[PDB]
Amino acid sequence: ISAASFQETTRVLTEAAVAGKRDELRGLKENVIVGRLIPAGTGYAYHQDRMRRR
Amino acid sequence: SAAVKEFFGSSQLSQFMDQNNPLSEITHKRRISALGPGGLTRERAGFEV
Amino acid sequence: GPEEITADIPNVGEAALSKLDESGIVYIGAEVTGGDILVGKVTPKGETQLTPEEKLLRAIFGEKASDVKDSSLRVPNGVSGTVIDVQVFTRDGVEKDKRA
Amino acid sequence: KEMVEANLRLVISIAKKYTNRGLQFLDLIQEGNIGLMKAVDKFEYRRGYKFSTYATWWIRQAITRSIADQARTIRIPVHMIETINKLNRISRQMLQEMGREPTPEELAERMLMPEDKIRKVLKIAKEPISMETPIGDDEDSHLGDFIEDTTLELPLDSATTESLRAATHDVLAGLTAREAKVLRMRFGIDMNTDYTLEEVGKQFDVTRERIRQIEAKALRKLRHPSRSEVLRSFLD
Amino acid sequence: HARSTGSYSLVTQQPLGGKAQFGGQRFGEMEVWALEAYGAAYTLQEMLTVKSDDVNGRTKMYKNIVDGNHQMEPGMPESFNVLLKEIRSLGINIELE
Amino acid sequence: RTTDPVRMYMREMGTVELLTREGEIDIAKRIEDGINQVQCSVAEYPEAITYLLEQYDRVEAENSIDPELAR
Amino acid sequence: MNISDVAKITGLTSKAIRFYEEKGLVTPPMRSENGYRTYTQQHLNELTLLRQARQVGFNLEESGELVNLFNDPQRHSADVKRRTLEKVAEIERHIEELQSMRDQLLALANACPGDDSADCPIIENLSG
Amino acid sequence: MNISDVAKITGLTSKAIRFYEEKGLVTPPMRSENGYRTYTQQHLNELTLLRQARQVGFNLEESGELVNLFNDPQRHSADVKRRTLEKVAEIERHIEELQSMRDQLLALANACPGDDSADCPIIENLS
Amino acid sequence: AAFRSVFPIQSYSGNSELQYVSYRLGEPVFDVQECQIRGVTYSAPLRVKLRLVIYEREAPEGTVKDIKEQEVYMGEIPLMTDNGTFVINGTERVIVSQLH
Amino acid sequence: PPDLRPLVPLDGGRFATSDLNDLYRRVINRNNRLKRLLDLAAPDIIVRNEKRMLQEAVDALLDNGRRGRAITGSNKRPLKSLADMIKGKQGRFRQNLLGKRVDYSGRSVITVGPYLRLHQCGLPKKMALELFKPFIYGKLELRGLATTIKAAKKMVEREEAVVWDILDEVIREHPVLLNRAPTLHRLGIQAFEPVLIEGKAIQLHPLVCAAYNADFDGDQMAVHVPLTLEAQLEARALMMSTNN
Amino acid sequence: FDAIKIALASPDMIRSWSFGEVKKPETINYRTFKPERDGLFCARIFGPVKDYECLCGKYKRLKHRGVICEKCGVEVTQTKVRRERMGHIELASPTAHIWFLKSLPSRIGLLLDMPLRDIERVLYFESYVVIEGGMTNLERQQILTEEQYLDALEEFGDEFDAKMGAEAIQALLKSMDLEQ
RNA sequence: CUCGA
DNA sequence: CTTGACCTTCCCCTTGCTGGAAGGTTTATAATGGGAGCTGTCACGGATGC
Ligand SMILES: [Ag+]
Ligand SMILES: [Mg+2]
Ligand SMILES: [Zn+2]
């Protein structure tokens, strides 16, 4: 998702659909899309309580 | 009456008149555009034109 | 049903209909402010379902607003002025008002 | 198969003219081929007529049928297209004759119709605008960025409808035991649905009239100005 | 020009644009980068879901603010599960887990 | 080497030849001799007997033909 | 005064009075907080004026202008005599149409003995 | 013989023949290997009987049994004469009441000269 | 020049042609003071005298069959006011030049 | 789904559709014609053309300008396909997901004022009356000055006496952002503590203009309010102008 | 949720998303503004038009929470569900997805080991392709011409099987083995 | 499309 | 609390048709290959094809 919003959405979505690619929402441009707290700043303290209890 | 009314009213050169002066009315008619049909565009004009 | 330009307006008191004339269009030369009504135009509304507590309120009191609905023309906000010209066009086969 | 494949130029000779922009160019050819395949099975060779005499009708019918059933977003029936086209042919002739654009009142004189009928037919047309068209001369401002959603409930009209619900839940507490329940399920307040007079009379004992008397006494209790002062300003 | 609430758009359900249209200003990605750099993630979660694009988010925040309790109530934006329907219509199965 | 479909369609239809005046009569004779075998070969089946029964019993209670030819 | 005895005062029925209201020819009867209707002497005159038209005088479309002119204070005697005389003339033209039917059945019914012999001439002749 | 050519021989409307086929009056016509009514001279005779019966004064049901009295070969004409005499008696009963309307309307149209007054002798009787 | 370049056009089989005679600009229906009011194009109706001729079939060069000459309306052209401002739909519009 | 490609009637009676109802209608039309042609026992030159046209109508829907000539509508414009709705500067990604249009926002011409401090900024009264409207309703209902919201909106519509003394309680200790486009670097958006001036121009402190690169010659700045109690603390300890 | 997955879509998955097969190209009616049966806007497939009303109006008023009307088939729910219900079209012939065909690299000739210039002579109905050859004179994926197929049909009979169109490429991808 | 920073 | 008497609106029903809407089926001199639109950007990366 961090590549499909940048450039060449057709090639990035096609290459990642025949491979069965699994996203993980690591960076802080996918959390802006899905409407979630980014893993930096004040969200980073909260994000460890989600990462640890999982 | 479709083609003539299309030109007078939908072209890139049949533009609205600036009428908030006597000056701005008279310098909008002596304006030589270079865009439109058979010309350049604002994404394909370098430093040379 | 067709819409109508009437001086009668629902849910609006006398304080906004002071400048509207007999026919519903504002006088020439009347000083207006932001929000005041220039042309009183009402539109018919198809009947809708009602939430039950409002259905209780309209049985406690006798208020029954009709299918009329206000969608009139108001001056946009932060604007003073003075009505200096009013033009009225009408279709063929339609009876004109008193102002027209 | 050979008679169908041999006359495949006649259909593209007829379908040059019906390219008025409802359908693409290939769809007219593919409808005219089905017209030609209908024309092959009907064609009698006994009458001494050539095949192009007969098959032109069955090609023109198929093209002019598909162009009136398809090629429109809001689909117009077939008999209304004739009523539109008579009006448009008469309005084409009146411009050459008079020189001025015909009003519907003088158009109804030529059409021999009532004027409201002609005003009804001149409403059906004008196939819809694309929501991606640009409304200035731009390319960044499409028409689809100006259409306001009207089905949404207002956030101020969705905050007062909770305060009214809370105030109705408040003021019904002073009503003691029977008039509260029959007032709630008489107007459907906090119920799945509304109950009629006999369906709520069958719940308490049997009675139809006693329920109405309880309702009238409850409304007389509510209208007394010691509880409904809060519900005065919910009215307007 | 100033605007609190009103006249949301049709498909995307985020508010309109224009002073004559009574629309709010655009919080473009040039400002989303500038709020990522400050680390203010709670101002970024608010200016994506509960201010603009949610449907069950605005009319709850309005009751919370009028009631006197400033409390964020998040939710997925409506512009994301239109992107899911427009990717899914290409025969490309995209889901959540 | 092309992508316009109308060129492909016209190139595909271009291989066949137009017909003369007697060619259509020849192909019509072919169609009539194709259906006449089905007509003269169905006469050895009981469904043809059923067709005869229904078609004369319909006119039992009854160019545009004269009714005496149908009787 | 509701719609209880006004139907018996004038002579009509209840559904007739409601239909006369719905057709748009009398004063709309005033309502009092129950959906019920009220009546005054104006309606007690107008309903009799329209009922007496229906039995002897007029029809429902012509009985509208009569009560439209009766309630007016500026009514004149010019706009009544023409409207009764032209339809008395129409009544006599209907008398003549019924006389046409009368003698077209009288001249046809004669000279045809109806007995046990079939092939009667008049019925086979009026067929064609 | 379709439905439009029988409209020109007799004079009925093309919808009225479908109406008379809907109610029980005429002989049902055959179909023509498709949805098309075909007509013979029997239906023509029944329709030119029914149009004349409508024009002389019969209603739809006594004509609706008159057509059945025409179809059967018996037609014992005693009830035929009975029904025609009942019909002319019905015409007498209508014309006596209609001329009674005439007599009761001529006695009130004597007055009211038609001046610019505000009173009328006619508007006061029925009111 | 725009008429004389296209016309005279002939029939497909070479048995007729449309000849062009002259054109003529009629009077404008409205003046410029009310085209800015009612919202209509300040234009002039364009008429043209056209001559349709029928050439004989068997004749080698036979023009004498019939001469049909009639005046045909074809569209309008928007006139120019006294300053170079076309009035299109009530709003004054100016066409700039081009440099190609 | 039929509410992401809608068909809405406008004011004048003309409808206004999206363009997916043309490409979808072409796919359904040519598919029905292929179903009819396979039951008529048509020759091969017709069926081979009809399958080709069905394939062309499918990939004119999935991605328009890729196979051959782009499909044009009636405006002589290429129709926007499904792949033209997620790419470029007009897709869902770059225009409607990464950056949205927000509520509680404003826009005005900036002006200089040197009487301020480093953490303050001016604000017009007619702008802060519109940004802080639900806060004003929540303060007017708590003090009993209006019994309901529908009777509290009229006290703001009349601009009474008690509103301008409630606004000074609502506004104080409530920061407000100030964005100027183009927001180049991190200091291009800062949070100030507002005051209330009459007029129609945001008065800015003269020292922060080096960070904004703002010359007072007709510039405009956007006003964004933080709503919650966490965001209001991320504008005082993280984005206040006395911290940058 | 904590992760987004993306993959290809089987026809069983598209039938599992779908709520009803669209059959007619009609959008709405012209006199009243109502969606038509089995159209692109149909009330049976994609949900009702107004809140808690069917099309005919036989059921209203929130009492019927989830019933389906017997006349018009409309399930009485909110009108919010018109943004979440999808339908499907049953194609009368298979067709190729353009993303997995004409992206660069080809992604469908990358698997078949065949150039795109050779695949597009089979998607367009221009040249046959050999799916399998029982007699190994005709190899796998050896493209025959239009007239050469007439020689190969008479020299072998029905020992080979050649097709043309998108079903040829579908039977070519279907009859491969990845594990060899 | 023209204008403003 | 109870009984009968009255009210409300709304749906169906009475003739002798007539008006309108929505759908389907044919028609026989001879007609046999489209046309609209593009040219005044530059710089790559990387398929592709002898
Ligand atoms: Ag007799
Ligand atoms: Mg500046
Ligand atoms: Zn239903």
Tab-separated table of N, CA and C in Angstrom, chain B:
chain	number	residue	atom	x	y	z
B	1	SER	N	-25.626	26.100	-37.024
B	1	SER	CA	-25.916	26.773	-35.770
B	1	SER	C	-25.382	26.019	-34.562
B	2	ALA	N	-24.944	24.770	-34.729
B	2	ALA	CA	-24.227	24.100	-33.654
B	2	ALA	C	-22.759	24.487	-33.662
B	3	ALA	N	-22.137	24.514	-34.846
B	3	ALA	CA	-20.707	24.803	-34.931
B	3	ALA	C	-20.398	26.255	-34.584
B	4	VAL	N	-21.204	27.191	-35.096
B	4	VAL	CA	-20.962	28.608	-34.839
B	4	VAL	C	-21.196	28.938	-33.369
B	5	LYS	N	-22.268	28.403	-32.785
B	5	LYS	CA	-22.527	28.625	-31.370
B	5	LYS	C	-21.583	27.835	-30.478
B	6	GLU	N	-20.943	26.789	-31.003
B	6	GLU	CA	-19.913	26.099	-30.241
B	6	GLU	C	-18.647	26.929	-30.170
B	7	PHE	N	-18.256	27.535	-31.294
B	7	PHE	CA	-17.094	28.421	-31.291
B	7	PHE	C	-17.343	29.654	-30.432
B	8	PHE	N	-18.402	30.406	-30.727
B	8	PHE	CA	-18.789	31.526	-29.869
B	8	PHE	C	-19.442	30.964	-28.611
B	9	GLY	N	-18.619	30.520	-27.670
B	9	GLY	CA	-19.182	30.098	-26.406
B	9	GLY	C	-18.566	28.896	-25.726
B	10	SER	N	-17.705	28.148	-26.409
B	10	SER	CA	-17.047	27.034	-25.745
B	10	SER	C	-15.581	26.874	-26.103
B	11	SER	N	-15.002	27.771	-26.888
B	11	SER	CA	-13.605	27.625	-27.247
B	11	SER	C	-12.710	28.117	-26.117
B	12	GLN	N	-11.411	27.870	-26.267
B	12	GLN	CA	-10.432	28.397	-25.328
B	12	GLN	C	-10.084	29.848	-25.601
B	13	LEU	N	-10.532	30.400	-26.725
B	13	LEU	CA	-10.237	31.773	-27.082
B	13	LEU	C	-11.438	32.693	-26.964
B	14	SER	N	-12.632	32.154	-26.750
B	14	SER	CA	-13.823	32.967	-26.532
B	14	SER	C	-14.052	33.131	-25.034
B	15	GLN	N	-13.195	33.927	-24.413
B	15	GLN	CA	-13.173	34.000	-22.963
B	15	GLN	C	-13.968	35.192	-22.449
B	16	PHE	N	-14.282	35.124	-21.160
B	16	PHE	CA	-15.065	36.124	-20.453
B	16	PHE	C	-14.309	37.449	-20.409
B	17	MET	N	-15.044	38.559	-20.421
B	17	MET	CA	-14.403	39.868	-20.481
B	17	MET	C	-14.238	40.468	-19.093
B	18	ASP	N	-13.037	40.975	-18.822
B	18	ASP	CA	-12.741	41.711	-17.600
B	18	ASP	C	-13.238	43.143	-17.769
B	19	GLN	N	-14.240	43.529	-16.985
B	19	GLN	CA	-14.941	44.788	-17.196
B	19	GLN	C	-14.889	45.698	-15.975
B	20	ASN	N	-13.844	45.600	-15.157
B	20	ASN	CA	-13.761	46.434	-13.965
B	20	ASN	C	-12.892	47.666	-14.172
B	21	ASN	N	-12.753	48.126	-15.413
B	21	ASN	CA	-12.021	49.334	-15.769
B	21	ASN	C	-12.369	49.766	-17.186
B	22	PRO	N	-11.971	50.958	-17.606
B	22	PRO	CA	-11.899	51.231	-19.041
B	22	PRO	C	-10.600	50.712	-19.618
B	23	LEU	N	-9.564	50.640	-18.784
B	23	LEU	CA	-8.282	50.120	-19.243
B	23	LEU	C	-8.344	48.617	-19.438
B	24	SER	N	-8.859	47.896	-18.442
B	24	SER	CA	-8.887	46.443	-18.495
B	24	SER	C	-9.828	45.916	-19.561
B	25	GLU	N	-10.794	46.719	-19.988
B	25	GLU	CA	-11.613	46.341	-21.127
B	25	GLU	C	-10.832	46.475	-22.428
B	26	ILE	N	-9.963	47.483	-22.530
B	26	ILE	CA	-9.314	47.758	-23.808
B	26	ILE	C	-8.031	46.957	-23.994
B	27	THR	N	-7.418	46.456	-22.927
B	27	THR	CA	-6.220	45.649	-23.084
B	27	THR	C	-6.518	44.165	-23.060
B	28	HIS	N	-7.787	43.787	-22.985
B	28	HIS	CA	-8.189	42.405	-23.166
B	28	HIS	C	-8.523	42.094	-24.613
B	29	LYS	N	-8.692	43.112	-25.448
B	29	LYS	CA	-8.956	42.902	-26.862
B	29	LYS	C	-7.690	42.947	-27.695
B	30	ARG	N	-6.679	43.683	-27.247
B	30	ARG	CA	-5.360	43.647	-27.875
B	30	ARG	C	-4.452	42.675	-27.127
B	31	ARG	N	-4.905	41.434	-27.038
B	31	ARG	CA	-4.164	40.386	-26.357
B	31	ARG	C	-3.911	39.264	-27.344
B	32	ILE	N	-2.643	38.920	-27.535
B	32	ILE	CA	-2.277	37.889	-28.492
B	32	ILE	C	-1.956	36.613	-27.737
B	33	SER	N	-2.942	35.740	-27.596
B	33	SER	CA	-2.680	34.450	-26.990
B	33	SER	C	-1.896	33.572	-27.954
B	34	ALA	N	-1.250	32.549	-27.406
B	34	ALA	CA	-0.563	31.565	-28.222
B	34	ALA	C	-1.100	30.162	-28.017
B	35	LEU	N	-2.087	29.989	-27.151
B	35	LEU	CA	-2.660	28.686	-26.863
B	35	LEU	C	-3.863	28.442	-27.767
B	36	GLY	N	-4.622	27.394	-27.480
B	36	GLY	CA	-5.800	27.089	-28.249
B	36	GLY	C	-5.553	25.987	-29.255
B	37	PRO	N	-6.467	25.828	-30.210
B	37	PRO	CA	-6.292	24.790	-31.230
B	37	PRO	C	-5.175	25.141	-32.197
B	38	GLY	N	-4.360	24.143	-32.516
B	38	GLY	CA	-3.236	24.367	-33.401
B	38	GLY	C	-2.099	25.136	-32.774
B	39	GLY	N	-1.936	25.042	-31.459
B	39	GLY	CA	-0.871	25.757	-30.791
B	39	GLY	C	-0.187	24.952	-29.710
B	40	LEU	N	0.362	25.644	-28.723
B	40	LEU	CA	1.130	25.024	-27.658
B	40	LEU	C	0.211	24.599	-26.516
B	41	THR	N	0.812	24.230	-25.389
B	41	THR	CA	0.095	24.024	-24.141
B	41	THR	C	1.036	24.364	-22.996
B	42	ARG	N	0.493	24.387	-21.784
B	42	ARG	CA	1.264	24.841	-20.634
B	42	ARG	C	2.139	23.756	-20.023
B	43	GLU	N	2.124	22.544	-20.567
B	43	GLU	CA	3.004	21.479	-20.110
B	43	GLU	C	3.987	21.034	-21.178
B	44	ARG	N	4.008	21.697	-22.328
B	44	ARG	CA	4.913	21.341	-23.410
B	44	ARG	C	5.514	22.591	-24.036
B	45	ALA	N	5.940	23.533	-23.203
B	45	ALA	CA	6.563	24.766	-23.666
B	45	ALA	C	7.769	25.054	-22.789
B	46	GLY	N	8.952	25.035	-23.386
B	46	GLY	CA	10.192	25.211	-22.660
B	46	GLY	C	10.565	26.665	-22.477
B	47	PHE	N	11.860	26.891	-22.265
B	47	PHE	CA	12.390	28.237	-22.098
B	47	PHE	C	12.574	28.969	-23.416
B	48	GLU	N	12.385	28.296	-24.546
B	48	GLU	CA	12.694	28.893	-25.837
B	48	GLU	C	11.539	29.696	-26.408
B	49	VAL	N	10.302	29.315	-26.113
B	49	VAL	CA	9.159	30.026	-26.665
B	49	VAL	C	8.783	31.224	-25.798
